[PDB]
Amino acid sequence: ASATRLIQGLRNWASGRDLQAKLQLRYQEISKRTQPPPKLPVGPSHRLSNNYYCARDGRREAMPPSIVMSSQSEKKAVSPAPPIKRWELSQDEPYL
Amino acid sequence: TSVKPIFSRDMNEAKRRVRELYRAWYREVPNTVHLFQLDISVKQGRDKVREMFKKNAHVTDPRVVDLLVIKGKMELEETINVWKQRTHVMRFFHETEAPRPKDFLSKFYVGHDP
Amino acid sequence: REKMFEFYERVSGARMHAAYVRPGGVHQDLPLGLMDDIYEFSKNFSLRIDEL
Amino acid sequence: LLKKTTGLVGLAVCETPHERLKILYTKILDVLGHIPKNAAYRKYTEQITNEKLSIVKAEPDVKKLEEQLQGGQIEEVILQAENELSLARKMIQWKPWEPLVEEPPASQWKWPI
Amino acid sequence: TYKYVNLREPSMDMKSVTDRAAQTLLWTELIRGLGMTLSYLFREPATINYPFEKGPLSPRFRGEHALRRYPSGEERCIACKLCEAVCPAQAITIEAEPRADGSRRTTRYDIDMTKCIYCGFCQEACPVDAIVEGPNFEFSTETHEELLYNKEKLLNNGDKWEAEIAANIQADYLYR
Amino acid sequence: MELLQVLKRGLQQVSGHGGLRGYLRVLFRANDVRVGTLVGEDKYGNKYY
Amino acid sequence: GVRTSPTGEKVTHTGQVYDDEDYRRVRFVGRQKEVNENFAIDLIAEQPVSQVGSRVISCDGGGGALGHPRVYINLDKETKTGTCGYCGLQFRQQH
Amino acid sequence: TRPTVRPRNDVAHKQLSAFGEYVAEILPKYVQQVQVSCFSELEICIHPDGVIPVLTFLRDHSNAQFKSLADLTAVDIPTRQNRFEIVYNLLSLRFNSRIRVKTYTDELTPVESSVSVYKAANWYEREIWDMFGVFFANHPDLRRILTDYGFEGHPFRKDFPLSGYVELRYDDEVKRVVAEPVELAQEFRKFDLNSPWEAFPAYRQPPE
Amino acid sequence: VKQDMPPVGGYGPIDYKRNLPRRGLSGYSMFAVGIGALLFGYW
Amino acid sequence: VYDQVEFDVPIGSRGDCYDRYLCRVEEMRQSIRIISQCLNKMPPGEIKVDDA
Ligand code: SF4
Ligand code: SF4
Ligand SMILES: [Zn+2]
């Protein structure tokens, strides 16, 4: 940022870009190293009522794997899922 | 009590394979001493190959000796190709290891282990 | 890449091995002013890709 | 209209896709007729192959055939038909409609142990 | 939602063919590359003057371990061994006894700084903020065992760096 | 011309370290001669700018 | 209150010192034995016993969330002061 | 159970159950179990004589098209008589799906190599030779891939110790890196962490 | 609450596309300059 | 939350080292696009699961 306008114009010309607009070195535009203290919010389970853990217990609603076939008609042939949708070419920048 | 074989249908084909592996190792020992510039004799290396074969001489299962032939062929391929260095070949010769006490009285002297 | 390691160090305290993304969320919230510096990095990073 | 490339490396463009698909589907049905009638591989593969062959006979276009066969490019649909043919020729040899060769041991699939 | 990098056919009119042949014979893109490198020649470099200048750090930084005391001189550690239970490298070795006033304190507190992975799980497992991983990163030794810290070295790192560790914990305890 | 300002900033970097003795002192100790605002000095003599 | 063995070796706050005939003193030969001279058992005994006017006091070591978990100390013994098991600060019911 | 619990996917659960029935009745010669976990992942437990007919099916069948071998894995379980559990993770790009094909072997029974199905397996099962000792028949170049060249044993078995049996150091008498029996300056401290209260009643086993 | 949040109108637009900005003379012009330099040198 | 961010996927055409190079360059471009969207759409709230 401290460069003279002769070196600045030379540097912009040699790169072919406006380099002073986007300087990779950092100056006073970055955040302060000292910040005010935060007040972080609490989650949804910080409630004094209607907050029994048996109604929000993720690990205890895990089930054993449902056994479909075990060795102890004209029904449709299935796939594991419907076939994947063909992607759309990008409207932003297709390179075509 | 009916299992699937690995290579051998019985013990005799397995002993054929053990025999051919010992033949291949016996042929390879002088090349191994020469190109790894080992400071053992060729007789000492052939004695070590004899020792590594005769350690396993009590095995009566065809599948286990098939796997021992397979692992011995893998060691042989890693020795013929220079994939092992001199250190991996000389690890069969426990040189830096001091000889452990073998009788009862000296094991009693040195510590607690049997 | 040094500035992005500063982003890792500000978010976790280690420049590379953060141990930050944990099962259940992340270990710690963003420090105040971090997203402004991520903005100031990202706004200028396109010119760096362009000159590469 | 002759699509210039498939977009996939090593997958060439098929000049006549409809005739190639009809040949491959009738060849899959021919190989698949050698399988017994009770076999679920025969019934399921005849079902999907007859559906695909009906769709190929129903559409003159290549693009609309690609959008309603729903398998990507038409050339990888041809590739999938060849893989299905090779699979069915192997399934003749394997005979997997036969009963289970061996029950597993008593707690072979018990987890947690 | 996808794009094709390198799916351009170059134009085949005489203008573009002569442009490409002038690029070939007259080396236009090579002069472009030389110009970009000359553009970096006239930039101020990114080099800081270490050790007189220092790389920027945060108060979350995980450096050298230290044991903290209360604002009465009593050490915070009450020998609960949560730091050595959580320790991913088993770098912490703790032995304890009741000392002469019956307080629950450690007799051994070792951190192997050559096993330690500097992940800070010990400081966040600590219920009393006793073990902390401080701001110091400049503690290279000439001997392996000088990095095998015992309780005396860790309490001395606490006494050495407490004026800074207290301010980093002041700036970062509300995120914890 | 803006080269004259560059040479004048260099000469006042020489004049800003307390002459040629301080300039060469900080040049050989620091390998940097730019001047700053003295933020402080500790009880050891480390000076912070 | 650090002291010194007959071998000249400093005794740590734990009480560790090497014996005279112990070879492991040779690691301190030509070098130092790093002990910490701030004994917490001495520094906590310098604190004044806090007179309070309740029957049960609480202690978190000060600093709120920067100290230890908050514990409640019963002060019904007039023989003994109520001592925090975390910080070692001790309390006495004033009546 | 809205914010903190993972939302259950019933549609993919139903579709994977139907496709597991499909795979099981097309291939009943080898398929021993079919199961779908609660997080909607399909496992096809097969017999080890049908590694190749199953995996060539799922790679080539027009309703499966599992064209990618994502990962091949062994799991040692010493309480089983077939202690090794070989696990094939497959990715179908066409139907945007993943499947798991699990089979078993012990120390001595070979598994047929799936390099004629997926060339990707060429190192994975080679790793399974190095780490578990599961021999693979008809592998093109079966040898070790991760351990040291003179290494005895197979490390990822659970009867193999955490540290090895030998450690290495440079010996200056012999001018060489040498192997010695391992002696730790500090033993690894085994922690007994398991709580004696049952955590998950859904997974309770019936008693003796 | 006080939390690391973006500004109210959001951040500014960030460039992310390729910018190789096409400098230099044409091929006709570069061959003409090279031929003119040769003709000056020959003369 | 990748289903909520908008980005493109660079596709090669010849499978060589050069197309993979261009794919990585354009993935850096699209990563800058995703980072812009993530900085614009960062919600408030907690950073761990409140299942303690
Ligand atoms: S930082 Fe991590 S590895 Fe190091 S002592 Fe603490 S818990 Fe152990
Ligand atoms: S440092 Fe903290 S976690 Fe470790 S034993 Fe002491 S009080 Fe417990
Ligand atoms: Zn207290």
| Inter-chain CB proximity I34 and E20 less than 8 Å | no
CA H142 vs CA D33, E166, H103: distances in Å: 39, 58, 20
d(CA E120, CA B74): 44
The radius of gyration of chain A from alpha carbons, rounded to an integer in Å, stands at 31
**Token pair belonging to H106:** 């012990």
Q: How far is G91 from chain E (nearest CA, A)?
A: 15
Is the C-beta atom of E130 inside 6 A of ligand 1? no
Answer yes or no: are the C-beta atoms of G45 and G32 closer than 8 Å.
Answer: no
G57 in Cβ contact with G75 (< 8 Å): yes
Q: Do I14 and J44 touch (CB under 8 A)?
A: no
The answer to whether E42 touches G50, Cβ cutoff 8 Å, is no
Angle between helices D74-94 and D40-58 (to 10 degrees): 160
Output the six-digit token pair for B73. Answer: 């062929």
In chain A, residues with a C-beta closer than 8 Å to the C-beta of E56 are 33
E126 lines ligand 1 (CB under 6 A): no
Residues in D 1-20 with any Cβ partner in J closer than 8 A: 5, 7, 9-10
Spatial CA neighbour of H131 closest among H114, H154, H148, H150: H154
What residue has token string 């190293």? A33
Nearest-by-CA chain H residue for B71: H143
**SS3 of residue A11 by DSSP:** helix
Judge: D48–H49 Cβ closer than 8 Å, yes or no: no
Neighbours of H206 (CB within 10 A): 4
- Give the CA angle between residues E95, E98, E101 to the nearest 5°: 140
Q: Is the preceding omega at residue D112 within 30 degrees of 0, hence cis? A: yes
Tokens of H136: 């693979």
Which residues are close to ligand 3, an ion, with C-beta < 5 A? G 59, 61, 84, 86-87
**Does ligand 1 lie within 6 Å of residue E92's CB atom?**
yes
Show Cβ contacts of residue C17 under 8 Å, excluding neighbours closer than 6 positions: E117, E118, E119
Residue of C nearest to J45 (CA): C29
Ligand 1 contact via E125 beta carbon (within 6 Å): no
G64 C-alpha to ligand 1 centroid (Å): 26
Q: Pull the structure tokens for residue A58.
A: 């993720």
CA distances from B20 to A86, B23, B26, B71 (A): 58, 5, 10, 14
Mutate: best of G2, G11, G13, partner E, most E CBs <10 A:
G13
Adjacent-strand bridge partners of H176: H171
What's the full length of chain G, in residues?
95
Is the CB of C25 less than 8 angstroms away from the CB of J46?
yes
d(CA H153, ligand 1 centre) in Å: 32
Nearest residue on chain A to D38, alpha-carbon basis:
A73
Cβ pair F17, F23 in contact under 8 A: yes
Structure tokens at F38: 């003295």
Of E86, E87, E123, which is best to mutate to test ligand 1, by the most ligand atoms within 8 angstroms of its C-beta? E87
Does ligand 1 have an atom closer than 6 angstroms to the CB of E117?
yes
- B84 torsion bin: left (phi>0), alpha (psi -120 to 50), beta (else): beta
Instruction: Point out which residues pair with H170 in neighbouring strands.
Output: H177
Give the number of other Cβ atoms within 10 Å of residue E144's Cβ: 9
Chains D and C in direct contact, meaning 3 or more beta-carbon pairs closer than 8 angstroms:
no
A92: amino acid identity, one letter: D
Are residues H177 and B83, on separate chains, in Cβ contact within 8 Å?
no
Q: Quick one: three-class SS letters along H31-95?
A: EEEEEECCCCCEEEEECHHHHHHHHHHHHHCCCCCCCEEEEEEEEECCCCCCCEEEEEEEEECCC
Q: How many domains does chain B have?
A: 1
Around ligand 2, the residues with Cβ closer than 6 Å are: E 77-83, 94, 125-126, 128, 130-131
Two structure tokens written together for H149: 């060249």
DSSP string, F10-23: HHHHHHHTTHHHHH
b/e per residue, E117-129, with b = 16+ CB within 10 A? ebbbbbbbbbebb
**Which residues sit opposite E148 in a β-bridge?**
E112
User: Number of folded domains in chain G?
Assistant: 1
Which residue minimizes the CA distance to atom 1 of ligand 2? E131
Kindly report the number of other CB atoms within 10 A of residue C25's CB atom: 14
Residue from B68, A22, D30 nearest H135 by CA? B68
The closest residue, in CA terms, to atom 7 on ligand 2 is E77
For residues E136 and E64, the answer to whether their CB atoms sit within 8 Å is yes
The angle at the Cα of B64, spanning B60 to B70, to the nearest 5 degrees, equals: 135
Token pair 């600060």 is found at G89
Task: Judge contact between H55 and H118, C-beta under 8 A.
Answer: yes
Element (H, E) at B45: helix B42-54
- Contact yes or no for H178/H171 (Cβ under 8 A): yes
Closest ligand to residue E76's CA: 2
- Token duo for residue C49: 């890709």
CB contacts, 8 Å: E19 with chain I: 26-27
Amino acid of residue D111 = W
The vertex-G3 CA angle with G1 and G7, nearest 5°, equals: 170
Give the method of determination: cryo-EM
Query: Do B and F touch (≥3 CB pairs < 8 Å)?
Result: no
Task: Report which bound ligand comes closest to the CA of E94.
Answer: 2
The helix/strand/coil state of H178 is: strand
Determine the distance separating the centroid of ligand 3 and the alpha carbon of G55, expressed in angstroms: 16
Helix, strand, or coil (residue H23): helix
Our answer on whether the CB atom of E87 is closer than 6 Å to any ligand 1 atom is yes
Residue of H nearest to E115 (CA): H186
User: How many cross-chain Cβ pairs, C to E, lie less than 8 Å apart?
Assistant: 36
What's the sign of the alpha-carbon dihedral A72, A74, A78, A82?
Answer: negative
Which string of DSSP letters, residue by residue, matches chain E?
-EEETT--PPP-SHHHHHHHHHHHHH-HHHHHHHHHHHHHHTSPP----TTTS-----TT---SEEE-B-TTS-BS-----HHHHH-TT--EEEEEEE-TT--EEEEEEEEETTT-----HHHHH-SSS-EEE-S------SSSGGGEE-HHHHHHHHHHHHHHHHHHHHHHGGG-
> Residue B113 is part of which domain span?
1-114
How far does the centroid of ligand 2 lie from the alpha carbon of residue E148, in Å? 18
Alpha-carbon distance of H186 to G82, in angstroms, equals: 40
Nearest to I21 by CA among H143, H138, E32: E32
3-state secondary structure of F49: coil
* Ligand 3 centroid distance, CA of J28 (Å): 53
Structure tokens at I42: 């020959």
CA angle H139, H142, H146 (to 5 degrees): 135
Is A71's CB within 8 Å of D48's CB?
Answer: no
User: Are G7 and G31 a contacting pair, CB within 8 Å?
Assistant: no
The dihedrals phi and psi of C46, each to the nearest 5 degrees, come to -65, -40
Contact A93 J8 (CB under 8 A): yes
G15 contact partners, CB below 8 Å, separation of at least 6: none
Closest CA to C48 of H132, E101, E39: E39
Residue in chain I nearest J39 by alpha carbon: I6
* Residues in Cβ contact with E27 at an 8 Å cutoff, skipping those fewer than 6 apart: none
Q: Using the beta-carbon criterion (under 8 Å), do E93 and H186 form an inter-chain contact?
A: yes
Cα separation, C42 vs F27, in Å, equals: 37
DSSP state of A30: S
d(CA F37, CA H170): 55
The answer to whether D9 contacts J11, with C-beta atoms less than 8 Å apart, is no
Is residue H113 within 8 A of residue H106, CB to CB? The reply is no
Tokens of H83: 């202690």
Does G have 3 or more CB contacts under 8 Å with B? no
**Structure token digits, residue E36:** 């970009």
Amino acid identity of residue H204, one-letter, is R
Of the residues D43, D50, D69, D77, the best mutation for testing chain A's interface (the one with the most A CB atoms within 10 Å of its CB) is D43
Domain boundaries, chain D: 1-113
Q: Using CA atoms, how far apart are residues B26 and B79, in angstroms rounded to an integer?
A: 13
Report CA-CA distances (Å) from F3 to A3, F6, H129.
11, 5, 72
Q: How far apart are CA H20 and CA H118, in angstroms?
A: 21
Question: C52 to each of C39, E33, G22, how far by Cα in Å?
Answer: 21, 10, 65
Chain H CB contacts of A63 below 8 Å: 38, 202
Write out the two tokens for D82: 């060849």
Helix, strand or coil for residue A13? helix
Q: Which residues contact E99 (CB under 8 A, 6 or more apart)?
A: E105, G41
| Amino acid at residue number J25 | V
Residues from chain F that touch E164, judged by Cβ atoms under 8 A, are none
**Nearest by Cα to E91 from E64, E67, E118:** E118
Cα distance between residue D26 and residue D12, in whole Å? 22
Structural domain of G44: 1-95
Ligand 2 center from residue E79 Cα (angstroms)? 5
Chains touching chain B through at least 3 C-beta pairs below 8 angstroms are H
Phi, psi of E131 (to 5 degrees): -80, 130
DSSP state of G26: G
For residue E84, the ligand 2 atom closest to its alpha carbon is 4
Neighbours of H106 (CB within 10 A): 14
Q: How many residues does chain A have?
A: 96
